[PDB]
Amino acid sequence: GTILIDLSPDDKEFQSVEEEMQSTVREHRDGGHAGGIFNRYNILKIQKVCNKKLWERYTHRRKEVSEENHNHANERMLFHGSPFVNAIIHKGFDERHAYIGGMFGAGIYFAENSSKSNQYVYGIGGGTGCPVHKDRSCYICHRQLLFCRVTLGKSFLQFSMAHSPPGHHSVTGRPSVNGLALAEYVIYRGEQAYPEYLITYQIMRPE
Ligand SMILES: O=c1[nH]c2cc(Br)ccc2n2cccc12
Ligand SMILES: [Zn+2]
């Protein structure tokens, strides 16, 4: 049921998605080990992901959360990187996309920093890197990220599939050492995220 629609680079919607991608790159404490060494991306394509069934699944859960939280879904746009991006956009988020060993428990993880999600494109810790060259810092191979609509509801703040903490709908991982890191978030129900944009890109080698 999924259709992908290409956005033109001249479309303001392409341009606002690209700007969120580029502007939320940061340096990482692994010195690039997981995701590669770069300061910016070459964006190759941005597609809108359309699936009526998955969208309705998302909005149904969104209303349930809103009604549990004084009519406030606390909806964000967040990045998600995964070797399973193709199953996600076709069949939706579920248990198979959860991070069993995650430091906030076995939920599905999202990030404000696109470069954090980039570290997961080839798996946990960047796995063995790109399939072609076995390079976590490959500048040639095309990578993909999702830019997702996520319902946080009442989020449990951690300074630093399972269930979220009693009385909450998500967990927020607040950056507490690295003053430049943005927040990361975890949801415990696949229905609390919708993959809105599929972004195809390369990381760029700094000059
Ligand atoms: O975009 C992300 N994808 C992930 C995929 C797996 Br699988 C495990 C963890 C993350 N993760 C943690 C922070 C951000 C992300
Ligand atoms: Zn490669």
From Swiss-Prot:
Provide the protein's localization.
Answer: Cytoplasm; Golgi apparatus membrane; Nucleus; Chromosome, Telomere
The effect annotated for M103V is: Loss of activity
Taxonomically, the superkingdom here is Eukaryota
PARP catalytic domain: which residues? 8-207
Tissue expression per record: Highly expressed in placenta, skeletal muscle, liver, brain, kidney, heart, thymus, spinal cord, lung, peripheral blood leukocytes, pancreas, lymph nodes, spleen, prostate, testis, ovary, small intestine, colon, mammary gland, breast and breast carcinoma, and in common-type meningioma. Highly expressed in fetal liver, heart and brain.
**What about PTM?**
Ubiquitinated at 'Lys-48' and 'Lys-63' by RNF146 when auto-poly-ADP-ribosylated; this leads to degradation. Deubiquitinated by USP25; leading to stabilization.
Residues bound to Zn(2+) are: C130, H133, C138, C141
Subunit field text = Oligomerizes and associates with TNKS. Interacts with the cytoplasmic domain of LNPEP/Otase in SLC2A4/GLUT4-vesicles. Binds to the N-terminus of Grb14 and TRF1 with its ankyrin repeat region. Interacts with HIF1AN. Interacts with RNF146; this interaction leads to ubiquitination and proteasomal degradation. Interacts with NUMA1.
Function (record text): Poly-ADP-ribosyltransferase involved in various processes such as Wnt signaling pathway, telomere length and vesicle trafficking. Acts as an activator of the Wnt signaling pathway by mediating poly-ADP-ribosylation of AXIN1 and AXIN2, 2 key components of the beta-catenin destruction complex: poly-ADP-ribosylated target proteins are recognized by RNF146, which mediates their ubiquitination and subsequent degradation. Also mediates poly-ADP-ribosylation of BLZF1 and CASC3, followed by recruitment of RNF146 and subsequent ubiquitination.
Which family does the similarity line name? Belongs to the ARTD/PARP family.
Its recorded name reads Poly [ADP-ribose] polymerase tankyrase-2
Species of origin: Homo sapiens (Human)
What portion of the full-length protein is represented by this chain? Answer: 952 to 1161 of 1166
